[PDB]
Amino acid sequence: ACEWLGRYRMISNESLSLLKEMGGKYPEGTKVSFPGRLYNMIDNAKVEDQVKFLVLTLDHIIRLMDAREHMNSVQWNLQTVEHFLTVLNRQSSDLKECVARYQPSHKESYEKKINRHFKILKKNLKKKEYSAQAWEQIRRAVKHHLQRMDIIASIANRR
């Protein structure tokens, strides 16, 4: 089995504590559209698809948040942003070892759905010229992603 699914929750708890610690309470108007129905579907998916979904989603969060030259407007402590991303990169690398044992797939509707969501988050971030509000919207969405990802990992680990 994928040995890292047992370790995923402790490292997830660390990632969420870093996301909280790096900055303060949200500015006004941080609620944005979130793919709850997609996560309910993945909760019910095969382990293989759960783990592939976790890797796709981790890499998307990393690629959305690792352009630090676009973070001049945030009050976040960038040392803690860098620590956060280092932890997610560890999660992704470790789960990719599990994905390597699967037959590769690129036509799953979950991959298209999560790509579209992350394209929307990036578009709205650029439209708001990387404002503190725009980044806090992404911070709130990412917190929710990571909470639902920990539940997926737990469901995969207990099969």
Author numbering: 2 to 160
Sentences from the paper on this structure:
Teleost type I interferons (IFNs) are categorized into group I and II subgroups that bind to distinct receptors to activate antiviral responses. Based on the patterns of cysteines involved in the formation of disulfide bonds, teleost fish type I IFNs can be classified into two subgroups, one containing two cysteine residues (group I) and one containing four cysteine residues (group II), and can be further divided into seven phylogenetic groups, namely, IFNa–f and IFNh. However, despite a high sequence diversity, all type I IFNs share a similar structure consisting of 6 alpha helices (A–F) that are arranged in unique up-up-down-down topology. Functional studies have shown that CRFB1 pairs with CRFB5 to form a receptor complex that interacts with group I IFNs, while the CRFB2/CRFB5 form a heterodimeric receptor that is activated by group II type I IFNs.
